[PDB]
């Protein structure tokens, strides 16, 4: 607050002292906020008790996540998608910016771990131990979940481990293919960089004084018509920096109820089978894969869509 | 070069002792040091160890008392390779019944201002 | 009972929010304090000493400064109270959902499957006690997507075929129960030849030994 203002100014940090508190409430309220960027990504991808690996060797039935799953071959160890979704989306004047405490390769082990999990284990994992099942038996037991007898899987089992492995490289050319697709993250990365390219623009406003510039008053002007003059920019960019700061909290809120529904989301579509409609995509839910994003999450969700309905007769009682 | 300085303490109730933190410079324009993606890291005692985080520094270092204070990359949790086969399933024999807790606010205290 | 009365920082997001508004009416307070530009803090000292003319503009800048700090006060307890009541509105759907029914939404009511929630108040909050079932001591077993049995392919009705190395049973999902493999657990679809991984084994019928 007080470098923003005043720079290394004493006579304007003099000044600044009669105040009060002011400096050091808006200071606590950006502390704040940083504190609650860390916790929303925990809330959202620290939901495993264990770092989970997938074997070996990949055989899922005809199931291919190679997508999904890590490349090994590159540093960053993400996967395919999650590669691409990367690839996709001051300092002078007292503004800095701090770390994250989980970095991408943190938050890419957590989503690895969940995926391993989902895959070997299904929803177990989620509630207790976790415990292995063949992975065209867990989605025949989500097939289930959705009011479909569990030999319509096995007896389709190419079928549908076609159409699945289909679908998912459908998402990374889309991706590849489309420069809006990730524009809610963009819009996040756009307003927060014209919230603080705006606050250093206030910077070369007069507001009323002789100069925008602090030590033009201070080489030509002597201490009693100085004061005044700093007087009228103090006022300015304290009340500039103030309209900063409301607005973070007010976009900060936004921003932690997004978090919370993907926490919820993680939970309900990722560790389990939800019946909320719509909650988990379009269809009849079976299962959800996270893959992770800048300052971001992104789902995959897998549904069960019917096709090809027939006309029948039909009667309440025989 | 200019930034912030944050001290990293246990509580007084446990130890007069303190790590500093110079936020965003080097090690070398300072004037037990370790230089973090955070800043320049002086008092802790850096070690090759991890353990689930205590007090965050950033970019996945923690520091935490140990007497002495050190610093670490955090764990994210205990390896572990499920046992996945084609037709290997694994069902529990035994249950156990489970209690936890969850607190939320519901309200503030009722203020007025003349 | 006990972790409660052994640890301090457990009830921390109740304890926030009465720190948070204390520190908000102190520093509100502590505003009063301020000069703001005046010759003094104290409005009785400009009113005792100064006349009319120029008592005016000392009081403006308590004015501005006194209206500033208020509206910076209030405009911060909004904030806060949309947080409370975001909150709320969480409790009053995990009442409904955890305490009033059992919950097949994941981890909203606790780890593990929820089987009830309880109550409990506390000064400004509420405190809910989720208790679920959470499975143990799993072992390991083989398994078949179907049994062949007279050339038919059967499926468990409600649970999933185990061997324990030399016999074949079913058994529900969540506990194991082993059970025979009969025509009343199981149902039929179609011949042996399309499933994958169907296992040869027989299928009990219970009238057989009657008729
Ligand atoms: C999985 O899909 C990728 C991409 O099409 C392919 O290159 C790979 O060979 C497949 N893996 C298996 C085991 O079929
Ligand atoms: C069902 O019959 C109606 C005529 O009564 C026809 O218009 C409709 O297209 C048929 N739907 C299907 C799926 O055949
Ligand atoms: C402070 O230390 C004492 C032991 O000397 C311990 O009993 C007490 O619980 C500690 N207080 C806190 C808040 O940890
Ligand atoms: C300052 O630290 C960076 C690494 O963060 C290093 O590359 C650079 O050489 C250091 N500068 C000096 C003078 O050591
Ligand atoms: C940590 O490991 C590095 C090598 O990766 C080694 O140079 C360093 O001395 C080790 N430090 C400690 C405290 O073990
Ligand atoms: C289940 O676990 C409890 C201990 O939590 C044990 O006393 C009980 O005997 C176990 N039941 C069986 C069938 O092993
Ligand atoms: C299941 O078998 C694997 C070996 O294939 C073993 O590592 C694992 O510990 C066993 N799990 C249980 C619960 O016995
Ligand atoms: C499998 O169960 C049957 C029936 O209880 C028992 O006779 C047999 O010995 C068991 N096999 C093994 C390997 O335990
Ligand atoms: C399971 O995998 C083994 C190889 O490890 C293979 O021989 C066997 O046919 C597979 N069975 C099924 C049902 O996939
Ligand atoms: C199951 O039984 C049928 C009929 O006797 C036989 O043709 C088939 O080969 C058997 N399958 C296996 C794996 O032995």
């Given at each position: 607050?007080?470098?923003?203002?005043?720079?290394?100014?004493?006579?304007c940090?003099?000044?600044?002292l009669?105040?009060?508190?002011?400096?050091?409430?808006?200071?606590?309220?950006?502390?704040?906020?940083?504190?609650?960027?860390?916790?929303?990504?925990?809330?959202?991808?620290?939901?495993?008790?264990?770092?989970?690996?997938?074997?070996?060797?990949?055989?899922?039935?005809?199931?291919?996540?190679?997508?999904?799953?890590?490349?090994?071959?590159k540093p960053?160890?993400?996967?395919?998608?999650?590669?691409?979704?990367?690839?996709?989306?001051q300092?002078?004047?007292?503004?800095?910016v701090?770390?994250?405490?989980?970095?991408d390769?943190?938050?890419?082990?957590?989503?690895?771990?969940?995926?391993?999990?989902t895959?070997?284990?299904?929803?177990?994992?989620?509630?207790?131990?976790?415990?292995?099942?063949?992975?065209?038996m867990?989605?025949?037991?989500?097939?289930?979940?959705?009011?479909?007898?569990?030999?319509?899987?096995?007896?389709?089992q190419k079928?549908?481990?076609?159409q699945?492995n289909?679908?998912?490289?459908?998402?990374?050319?889309?991706?590849?293919?489309?420069p809006?697709?990730?524009?809610?993250?963009?819009?996040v990365?756009?307003?927060?960089?014209?919230?603080?390219?705006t606050?250093?623009?206030?910077?070369?406003?007069?507001?009323?004084?002789?100069?925008?510039?602090?030590?033009?008053?201070?080489?030509?002007?002597?201490?009693?018509?100085?004061?005044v003059?700093?007087?009228?920019?103090?006022?300015?960019?304290?009340?500039?920096?103030?309209?900063?700061?409301?607005?973070?909290?007010?976009?900060?809120?936004?921003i932690?109820?997004?978090?919370?529904?993907?926490?919820?989301?993680?939970?309900?579509?990722?560790?389990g089978?939800?019946?909320?409609?719509?909650?988990?995509?379009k269809?009849?839910?079976?299962?959800?894969?996270?893959?992770?994003?800048?300052?971001?999450?992104?789902?995959?969700?897998?549904?069960?869509?019917?096709?090809?309905?027939?006309?029948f007769?039909?009667?309440?009682?025989? | 070069?200019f930034?912030?300085?944050?001290?990293?303490t246990?509580?007084?109730?446990t130890?007069?002792?303190?790590?500093?933190?110079?936020?965003?410079?080097?090690?070398?324009?300072?004037?037990?040091?370790?230089?973090?993606?955070?800043?320049?890291?002086?008092?802790?005692?850096?070690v090759?160890?991890?353990?689930?985080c205590?007090?965050?520094?950033?970019?996945?270092?923690?520091?935490?008392?140990?007497?002495?204070?050190?610093?670490?990359?955090?764990?994210?949790?205990?390896?572990?390779?499920?046992?996945?086969?084609?037709?290997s399933?694994?069902?529990?024999?035994?249950?156990?019944?489970?209690?936890?807790?969850?607190?939320?606010?519901?309200?503030?205290?009722?203020?007025?201002?003349? | 009972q006990?972790?409660?009365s052994?640890?301090?920082?457990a009830?921390?997001?109740?304890?926030?929010?009465?720190?948070?508004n204390?520190?908000?009416?102190?520093?509100?307070?502590?505003?009063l304090?301020?000069?703001?530009?005046?010759?003094?803090?104290?409005?009785?000292?400009?009113?005792?000493?100064?006349?009319?003319?120029?008592?005016?503009?000392?009081?403006?800048?308590?004015?501005?400064?006194?209206?500033?700090?208020?509206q910076?006060?209030?405009?911060?307890?909004?904030?806060?109270?949309?947080?409370?009541?975001?909150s709320?509105?969480?409790?009053?759907?995990?009442?409904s959902?955890?305490?009033?029914?059992?919950?097949k939404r994941?981890?909203?009511?606790?780890?593990?499957?929820?089987?009830?929630?309880?109550?409990?108040?506390?000064?400004?909050?509420?405190?809910?006690?989720?208790?679920?079932?959470?499975?143990?001591?799993?072992?390991?077993?083989?398994?078949?997507?179907?049994?062949?049995?007279?050339?038919?392919?059967?499926?468990?009705?409600?649970?999933?075929?185990?061997?324990?190395?030399?016999?074949?049973?079913?058994?529900?999902?969540?506990?194991?129960?082993?059970?025979?493999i009969?025509?009343?657990?199981?149902?039929?679809?179609?011949?042996?030849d399309v499933?994958?991984?169907?296992?040869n084994?027989?299928?009990?019928?219970?009238?057989?030994?009657?008729?």
């Amino acid at each position: 607050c007080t470098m923003y203002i005043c720079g290394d100014s004493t006579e304007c940090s003099n000044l600044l002292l009669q105040y009060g508190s002011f400096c050091t409430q808006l200071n606590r309220a950006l502390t704040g906020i940083a504190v609650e960027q860390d916790k929303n990504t925990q809330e959202v991808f620290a939901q495993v008790k264990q770092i989970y690996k997938t074997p070996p060797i990949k055989d899922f039935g005809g199931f291919n996540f190679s997508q999904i799953l890590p490349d090994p071959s590159k540093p960053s160890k993400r996967s395919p998608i999650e590669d691409l979704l990367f690839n996709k989306v001051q300092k002078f004047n007292g503004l800095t910016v701090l770390p994250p405490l989980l970095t991408d390769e943190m938050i890419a082990q957590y989503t690895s771990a969940l995926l391993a999990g989902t895959i070997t284990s299904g929803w177990t994992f989620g509630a207790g131990p976790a415990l292995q099942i063949p992975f065209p038996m867990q989605m025949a037991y989500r097939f289930n979940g959705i009011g479909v007898t569990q030999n319509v899987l096995y007896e389709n089992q190419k079928l549908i481990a076609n159409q699945f492995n289909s679908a998912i490289g459908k998402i990374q050319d889309s991706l590849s293919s489309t420069p809006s697709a990730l524009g809610k993250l963009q819009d996040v990365v756009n307003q927060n960089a014209q919230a603080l390219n705006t606050l250093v623009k206030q910077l070369s406003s007069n507001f009323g004084a002789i100069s925008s510039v602090l030590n033009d008053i201070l080489s030509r002007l002597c201490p009693p018509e100085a004061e005044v003059q700093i007087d009228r920019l103090i006022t300015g960019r304290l009340q500039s920096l103030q309209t900063y700061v409301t607005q973070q909290l007010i976009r900060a809120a936004e921003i932690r109820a997004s978090a919370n529904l993907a926490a919820t989301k993680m939970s309900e579509c990722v560790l389990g089978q939800s019946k909320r409609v719509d909650f988990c995509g379009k269809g009849y839910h079976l299962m959800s894969f996270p893959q992770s994003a800048p300052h971001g999450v992104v789902f995959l969700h897998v549904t069960y869509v019917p096709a090809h309905e027939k006309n029948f007769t039909t009667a309440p009682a025989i | 070069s200019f930034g912030g300085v944050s001290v990293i303490t246990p509580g007084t109730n446990t130890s007069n002792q303190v790590a500093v933190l110079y936020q965003g410079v080097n090690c070398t324009e300072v004037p037990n040091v370790f230089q973090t993606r955070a800043g320049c890291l002086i008092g802790a005692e850096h070690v090759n160890n991890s353990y689930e985080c205590d007090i965050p520094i950033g970019a996945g270092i923690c520091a935490s008392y140990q007497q002495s204070i050190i610093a670490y990359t955090m764990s994210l949790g205990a390896e572990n390779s499920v046992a996945y086969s084609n037709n290997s399933i694994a069902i529990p024999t035994n249950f156990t019944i489970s209690v936890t807790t969850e607190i939320l606010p519901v309200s503030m205290t009722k203020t007025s201002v003349d | 009972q006990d972790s409660l009365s052994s640890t301090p920082s457990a009830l921390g997001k109740l304890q926030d929010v009465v720190n948070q508004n204390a520190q908000a009416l102190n520093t509100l307070v502590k505003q009063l304090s301020s000069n703001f530009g005046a010759i003094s803090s104290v409005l009785n000292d400009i009113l005792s000493r100064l006349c009319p003319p120029e008592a005016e503009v000392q009081i403006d800048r308590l004015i501005t400064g006194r209206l500033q700090s208020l509206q910076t006060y209030v405009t911060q307890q909004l904030i806060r109270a949309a947080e409370i009541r975001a909150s709320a509105n969480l409790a009053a759907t995990k009442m409904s959902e955890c305490v009033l029914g059992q919950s097949k939404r994941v981890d909203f009511c606790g780890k593990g499957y929820h089987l009830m929630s309880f109550p409990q108040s506390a000064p400004h909050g509420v405190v809910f006690l989720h208790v679920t079932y959470v499975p143990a001591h799993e072992k390991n077993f083989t398994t078949a997507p179907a049994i062949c049995h007279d050339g038919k392919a059967h499926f468990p009705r409600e649970g999933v075929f185990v061997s324990n190395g030399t016999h074949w049973f079913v058994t529900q999902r969540n506990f194991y129960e082993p059970q025979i493999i009969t025509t009343d657990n199981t149902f039929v679809s179609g011949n042996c030849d399309v499933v994958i991984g169907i296992v040869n084994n027989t299928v009990y019928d219970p009238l057989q030994p009657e008729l």
